[PDB]
Design an enzyme around this catalytic site. Structure first.
Site, PDB file in Angstrom:
ATOM      1  N   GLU A 229      -4.282  -7.004  -6.296  1.00  0.00           N
ATOM      2  CA  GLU A 229      -3.681  -7.853  -6.563  1.00  0.00           C
ATOM      3  C   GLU A 229      -2.103  -7.398  -6.469  1.00  0.00           C
ATOM      4  O   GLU A 229      -1.282  -8.537  -6.402  1.00  0.00           O
ATOM      5  CB  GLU A 229      -3.795  -8.102  -8.194  1.00  0.00           C
ATOM      6  CG  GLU A 229      -5.078  -8.645  -8.447  1.00  0.00           C
ATOM      7  CD  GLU A 229      -6.137  -7.579  -8.270  1.00  0.00           C
ATOM      8  OE1 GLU A 229      -6.106  -6.473  -8.670  1.00  0.00           O
ATOM      9  OE2 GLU A 229      -7.061  -7.827  -7.396  1.00  0.00           O
TER      10      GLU A 229
ATOM     11  N   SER B 157       0.749  -1.129  -0.193  1.00  0.00           N
ATOM     12  CA  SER B 157      -0.004  -0.035   0.091  1.00  0.00           C
ATOM     13  C   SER B 157       0.819   1.435  -0.011  1.00  0.00           C
ATOM     14  O   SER B 157       0.215   2.369  -0.220  1.00  0.00           O
ATOM     15  CB  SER B 157      -0.988  -0.134   0.993  1.00  0.00           C
ATOM     16  OG  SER B 157      -2.117  -0.989   0.936  1.00  0.00           O
TER      17      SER B 157
HETATM   18  C1  LIG Z   1      -1.689  -2.222   1.449  1.00  0.00           C
HETATM   19  O1  LIG Z   1      -0.734  -2.436   1.973  1.00  0.00           O
HETATM   20  C2  LIG Z   1      -2.970  -2.820   1.846  1.00  0.00           C
HETATM   21  C3  LIG Z   1      -2.736  -3.918   2.874  1.00  0.00           C
HETATM   22  N1  LIG Z   1      -3.818  -4.661   3.478  1.00  0.00           N
HETATM   23  C4  LIG Z   1      -5.204  -4.431   3.311  1.00  0.00           C
HETATM   24  C5  LIG Z   1      -5.679  -4.951   1.977  1.00  0.00           C
HETATM   25  O2  LIG Z   1      -5.041  -5.842   1.254  1.00  0.00           O
HETATM   26  O3  LIG Z   1      -6.596  -4.280   1.202  1.00  0.00           O
HETATM   27  C6  LIG Z   1      -6.183  -4.915   4.380  1.00  0.00           C
HETATM   28  C7  LIG Z   1      -7.461  -4.534   4.285  1.00  0.00           C
HETATM   29  C8  LIG Z   1      -5.492  -4.637   5.678  1.00  0.00           C
HETATM   30  N2  LIG Z   1      -5.427  -2.923   5.779  1.00  0.00           N
HETATM   31  C9  LIG Z   1      -6.673  -2.265   6.164  1.00  0.00           C
HETATM   32  C10 LIG Z   1      -6.049  -1.021   6.201  1.00  0.00           C
HETATM   33  N3  LIG Z   1      -4.727  -1.198   5.788  1.00  0.00           N
HETATM   34  N4  LIG Z   1      -4.565  -2.166   5.724  1.00  0.00           N
HETATM   35  S1  LIG Z   1      -5.890  -6.950   4.299  1.00  0.00           S
HETATM   36  O4  LIG Z   1      -4.507  -6.961   4.429  1.00  0.00           O
HETATM   37  O5  LIG Z   1      -6.769  -7.144   5.410  1.00  0.00           O
END
Ligand SMILES: *C(=O)/C=C/N[C@@H](C(=O)O)[C@](C)(Cn1ccnn1)[SH](=O)=O
Ligand SMILES: OC[C@H]1O[C@H](O[C@H]2[C@H](O)[C@@H](O)[C@H](OCCCCCCC3CCCCC3)O[C@@H]2CO)[C@H](O)[C@@H](O)[C@@H]1O
Length: 265
Positions: A143, A45
């Site tokens: 993805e 992210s």
């Molecule tokens: C970016 O790094 C996103 C990582 N994890 C997200 C995702 O894959 O969409 C989730 C939703 C966890 N998350 C929430 C907010 N930030 N990260 S997934 O890992 O549960």
């Protein structure tokens, strides 16, 4: 806490994974600490910050407006859209989408913005235009976190990411207003910002964007400094560790503690 480099090593030992890190003066670009800084790591992210830097470049050029309202459909939503799922009826402005992508890591907001800059390829071309010849985005929001070993897709290096963030925030490639906006979005992170402040000693500034993915992928791009100043850019990525999210978080915090206790280098 031990010296920064020694803590980084301890973290690899404890996680059985690779740690990638760069500590850089934000104002000048002076590199203080560099560990596996030229090695590839999944951006996860953290790519959302670069994404909005590309959007702000379009605004500066008059090809975009942060006010412009984008209307989307339910079919356009992907996994994890805490903000965007609430505006199917009224839409969101481009500026609101960046705030949601960066401060809440809203994935549908990130994808909507990604389309406006030409998709993963368009964002990669923007990176090439500001002089980053390493960082690459290849896939869309839900993805790009796969983190397959040996896969170069959706990766950056600590050195590349730090240099790119510094360029966006201070090189005047973006207008003064746009630089201030990108910084404010990072200051406003709701995912990790408040938590980090709760464990930071009084006087330490924090702005950040964090991320996570498969095979232990974890990442944070941040601005940190004493005297309530964004003195340094600190970029830390972790990859290929079977560790729990809690331990990956603890190790990153430990590197931060080492920086805090041994700041004057
Ligand atoms: C970016 O790094 C996103 C990582 N994890 C997200 C995702 O894959 O969409 C989730 C939703 C966890 N998350 C929430 C907010 N930030 N990260 S997934 O890992 O549960
Ligand atoms: O001597 C320096 C400080 O030492 C301790 O502070 C601890 C703090 O109590 C702990 O909660 C934190 O954990 C680290 C929390 C860091 C969280 C994430 C930081 C990010 C920021 C940028 C990217 C990488 C990591 O470490 C510091 C330094 O040992 C004392 O509690 C504090 O009074 C004192 O001023």
């Amino acid at each position: 806490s031990p010296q920064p480099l020694e803590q980084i090593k301890l973290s690899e030992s404890q996680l059985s994974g690779r740690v990638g890190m760069i500590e850089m003066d934000l104002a000048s670009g002076r590199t203080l600490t560099a560990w596996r800084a030229d090695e590839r790591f999944p951006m996860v992210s953290t790519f959302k910050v670069v994404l909005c830097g590309a959007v702000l470049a379009r605004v500066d050029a008059g090809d975009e407006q942060l006010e412009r309202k984008i209307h989307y459909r339910q079919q356009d939503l992907v996994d994890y859209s805490p903000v965007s799922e609430k505006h199917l009826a009224d839409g969101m402005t481009v500026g609101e989408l960046c705030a949601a992508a960066i401060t809440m890591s809203d994935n549908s907001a990130a994808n909507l913005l990604l389309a406006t800059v030409g998709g993963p390829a368009g964002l990669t071309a923007f990176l090439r235009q500001i002089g980053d010849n390493v960082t690459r985005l290849d896939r869309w929001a839900t993805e790009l976190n796969e983190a397959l070993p040996g896969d170069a897709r959706d990766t950056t290096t600590p050195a590349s990411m730090a240099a790119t963030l510094r360029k966006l925030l201070t090189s005047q490639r973006l207008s003064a207003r746009s630089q201030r906006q990108l910084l404010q979005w990072m200051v406003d992170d709701r995912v990790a910002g408040p938590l980090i402040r709760s464990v930071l000693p009084a006087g330490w500034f924090i702005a950040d964007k964090t991320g996570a993915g498969e095979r232990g992928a974890r990442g944070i791009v941040a601005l940190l400094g004493p005297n309530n100043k964004a003195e340094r850019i600190v970029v830390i990525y972790l990859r290929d560790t079977p560790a729990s999210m809690a331990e990956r978080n603890q190790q990153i915090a430990g590197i931060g503690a080492a920086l805090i206790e041994h700041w004057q280098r």
